[PDB]
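thread from #wetlab-drylab

HS: before we spend reagent money on co-crystallization trials with protoporphyrin IX containing FE, can we at least see a predicted complex? here's what I'd submit
DV: go for it
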Amino acid sequence: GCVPIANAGDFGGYYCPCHGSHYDASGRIRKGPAPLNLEVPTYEFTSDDLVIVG
Amino acid sequence: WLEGIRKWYYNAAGFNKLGLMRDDTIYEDDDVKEAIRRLPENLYNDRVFRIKRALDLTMRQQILPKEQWTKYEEDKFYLEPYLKEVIRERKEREEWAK
Amino acid sequence: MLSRFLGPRYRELARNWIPTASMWGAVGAVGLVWATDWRLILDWVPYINGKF
Amino acid sequence: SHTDIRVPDFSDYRRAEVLDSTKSSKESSDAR
Amino acid sequence: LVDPLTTVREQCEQIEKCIKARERLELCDQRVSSRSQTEEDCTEELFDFLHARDHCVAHKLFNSL
Amino acid sequence: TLTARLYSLLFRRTSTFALTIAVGALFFERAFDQGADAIYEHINQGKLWKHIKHKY
Amino acid sequence: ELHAPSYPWSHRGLLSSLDHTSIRRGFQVYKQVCSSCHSMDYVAYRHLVGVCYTEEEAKALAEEVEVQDGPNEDGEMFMRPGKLSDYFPKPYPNPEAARAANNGALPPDLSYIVRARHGGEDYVFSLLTGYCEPPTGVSLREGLYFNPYFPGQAIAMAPPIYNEVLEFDDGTPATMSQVAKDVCTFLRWASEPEHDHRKRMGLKMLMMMGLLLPLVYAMKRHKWSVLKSRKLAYRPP
Amino acid sequence: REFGHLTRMRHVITYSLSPFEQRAFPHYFTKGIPNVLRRTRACILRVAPPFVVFYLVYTWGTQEFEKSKRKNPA
Amino acid sequence: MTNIRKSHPLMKIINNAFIDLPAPSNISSWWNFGSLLGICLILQILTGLFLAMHYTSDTTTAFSSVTHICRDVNYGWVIRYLHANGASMFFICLFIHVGRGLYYGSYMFLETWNIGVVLLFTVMATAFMGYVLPWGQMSFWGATVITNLLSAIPYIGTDLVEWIWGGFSVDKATLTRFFAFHFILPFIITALAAVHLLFLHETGSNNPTGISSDMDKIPFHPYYTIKDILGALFMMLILLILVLFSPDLLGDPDNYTPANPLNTPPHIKPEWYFLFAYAILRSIPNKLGGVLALVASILILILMPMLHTSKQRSMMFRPLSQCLFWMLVADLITLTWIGGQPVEHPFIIIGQLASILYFLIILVLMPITSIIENNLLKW
Amino acid sequence: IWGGFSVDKATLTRFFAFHFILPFIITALAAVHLLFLHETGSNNPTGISSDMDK
Amino acid sequence: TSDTTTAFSSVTHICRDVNYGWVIRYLHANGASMFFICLFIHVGRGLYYGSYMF
Ligand code: HEM
Ligand code: HEM
Ligand code: HEM
């Protein structure tokens, strides 16, 4: 729960302030053992309008 | 050499410390049961008392004195021929069943 | 369970019970298909596929 | 041959109240 | 007001485990500051020093509290 | 002996054996709790609420 | 990974109870330092009676707070003085306001904080007393503080305790380590409020086992002596 | 399977004492301690070596794992 | 006239099961753990039912209901931690009981051995579903990992995992149905234990010598009722030491944190009595191969009678197979330790060698070594 | 039995627990019931023993 | 769920949202009544034919 800086980012779009696991636009861990980046779930990617996601 | 390895394993198995013979310890399946049923009465009675005595010993968590331990050269394989015959009869019935 | 059951009489027993066994296997297959409404298979049955 | 049968000595296991063969064991029975 | 923990920490820092770890830490501090851009960090060295100091301090602190 | 007397008076009959056990259970609960509690409050003397309540 | 040392707590021993005066001073620390950002959802005022406060003292402590009370005849919610049956006040209406007030971090509930951490009150004591400067090569974002005992060694809580952070009613200097020890004792009670009873029951159980196990062993061996002294003879024809 | 019809047994005599005639812990130490030591020598080389191997493997794995979290100068 | 103990239809069954049952006169303390198991079962039914008098299986109240049980219910902390450490004692007794069966060849009782395998699986399912009920972090995420393991199953994995969940993830429906299954399952376990004893009494108990003991049977009642009572008192001592002196020894602090589906714990381990299997599954890189190994590590108990290649039943007179048995116990201990550890160097290669060794012992080394022992005895 | 001063939360949860467990006790009692019945077999509408016509 | 804030709601949820939940609910409710109908007829039979002599 070391909440990132949502929608900003020192590197990209977010960044892990508590840890070093900063985030890019693809919300990628920059440096840290967090087992993955921000989870990218099942969605209907065709457009930000037309995403069922779930 | 296997007098060595075999006598060593006989000592290390330690049923001789209970006064047991090797054939006293065979797992009793059906073939072994028939082998025991065919045993002559004196052999059957000796086997039953040896087994009862060893059960009593292990109930007290005890072993016999070393002078009473089954010596390896005197372990009599009293049940081998009876078992061999029972097994041969079973093999005969199965070779027929084919 | 290795070769006591390996013989001429046992191959005859196998052949005798193979049609019954295969019929029972078809029974199991049809029952499993019908119980689960397995469309994968059931989409092929002419009139039954109307349910889908 | 049944007269050849003797009970083994149980002295090692006996309570001290009954170690003597020459004594009534009733005189300790209640205590035991 | 003075805190027990300060004086206990100094006394326990006078421990040779602490004395060795402190200059290991100060050689890390002399490197990482000399090198202009690195990934180290002297957290491991400080962790050794603090492990030693805090073992001694946990032995002696509650007596004055 | 004492144990002969105890057996003759209280143990021989099962009803009297049981009555002795019941009375003994009552008195044992009382004495054992008293002793165990005193031990626990001596080990933890001054630390418990009871020891310090009388200041508040 | 900097693991906490083992401190010689008064309650560490097997039959050793908590010191209840430290529990009382630790409630004063929680209720004057921690509570502004931490909740204790599962501890109510009534729980402190017979432990570190009398019922009158605890009723006045509940009176010191205002708690929201349910709908009126008109259907409005109102504020009333607290009661013994009331649980400890929550500093934030929801987790999101808690995170908003604390730079994105939600400060945890402390009812189980000692139980929910590896190392327990040792960890909490070392965390509260362990704020140092960041080492060479370590840089933390603003609003983060280096603590070697916190996983990652970057904690969103500023050092809460310091010398004379509060005043103690019994007059103890409120040195930082004293305040930490008191609050850690209180947190141990808040996680496990059966600790003293559990250990008194353990003492009784150990005594009862030390009596019964020899006695049941004697019963087993009295019945078994028939088999264990038994003699066997073989008299074949 | 009930008592009275389990096996045929012959020529076996058993002698037993009342539990009220004998003790429940006779020679409990003077004989029990040598028996425990005998029963320990009898099995110790069959039981112990696997647990020695586990101790060594556990010790090595733990110290090695902790030797990987250490900074290697680089 | 009759003895109603022998003539009365109910008392006749009781008499033949625990009073006039002929039992071997030499069965050791290791034969106590049957009666411990049935006692543990009863204890789990007793405390759990009293927990179920206060517990609620809604995810908004489950963790709170348990805190209420331990904080405000009279002696509810006693009942709660008696239940948790009684689950741990159940598994200790089960492992010792199965180890005794392996060592002494008790698996040659086919029906009661196979029913025992069924019982092992059902106790495991009950304990697993019970541990989710407090709805702590470990409850939630252990349920998450263990249930999503079942997605490895070909063609029906996702459908069956979602059906078990009753939804897209582990959630409210899963917790409520896990409470229902956790309630019902121990009574099915009771029925299976009764069937188990019915199959055992067909032959009676095996003994440490592995030799049939019918010439030296003693009545169950005076001897093994008192011996089983002493064993039960010793078991109670250990259980109460756990409950009253280290309630949290065998548990995990993260289950004192309410379940957070957003945050996952740094370590997600089962309980200790699952770690040996969790190691084996984690040793295999393939998801489905890992699940198959985690299932085979307990299904392999069904193979022991077919793997028996010794002329003797028990291990009492076979030093080499005793060596292999203690290696097997050591390998299970190292699998438990590995399963309690992260998946990183060196625990990965250690877990792999241990997982290989477990199967290599049971399936290969033990049979070949029994054959070698057979020839050393010249049969 | 209430667990309190009236019928309330404690009563409801304990009633759920007792209601869950009791039918299994009923199952065991029905098994004992049938065990006792089979000692004689069934009665019949005439009330006369029917061993000659089983 | 046996909490007093959710029991009525949980039953409503069973009858409105659980797939075939109203079937199971009202099957249970009327199977209790069928159980008592059968029990009363069973005991009446016992009284009428003297089955209590067992
Ligand atoms: C629900 C849990 C279980 C209970 C209550 C239970 C109960 C019992 C009891 C009371 C006995 C007789 C006493 C004894 O010899 O220990 C027994 C024997 C046995 N049990 Fe279990 N058991 C359980 C689980 C298992 C398991 C998991 C296995 C192994 C797969 C198993 C296999 C056996 C065997 C083989 C015997 C006979 C042992 C022998 O006589 O040598 N049981 N069981
Ligand atoms: C086979 C026997 C049983 C086993 C092995 C078992 C196991 C467990 C375990 C491990 C837990 C989690 C304990 C914890 O919080 O750490 C648990 C919880 C629970 N069990 Fe069981 N259980 C059994 C029987 C029962 C029965 C029969 C009931 C109901 C009558 C029950 C009711 C509960 C309840 C209500 C909880 C939640 C309360 C709690 O977490 O302590 N259990 N069980
Ligand atoms: C749990 C509910 C019950 C079940 C499952 C049950 C089951 C049975 C069954 C299967 C039979 C044999 C078939 C028959 O004659 O009906 C039977 C017979 C009998 N039941 Fe019940 N029963 C129950 C309740 C009762 C009740 C409430 C009584 C009255 C006190 C009772 C007394 C009898 C009697 C006397 C017989 C023998 C009737 C005869 O043969 O004439 N049972 N029961």
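DV: The pocket of protoporphyrin IX containing FE (ligand 1) is lined by residues I 31, 33-35, 37-38, 41, 94, 97-98, 101, 104, 106-107, 109, 112-113, 116-117, 119-120, 123, 189, 193, 196, 200, 205-206, 301 (CB under 6 Å).
HS: ok that's useful, forwarding to the group
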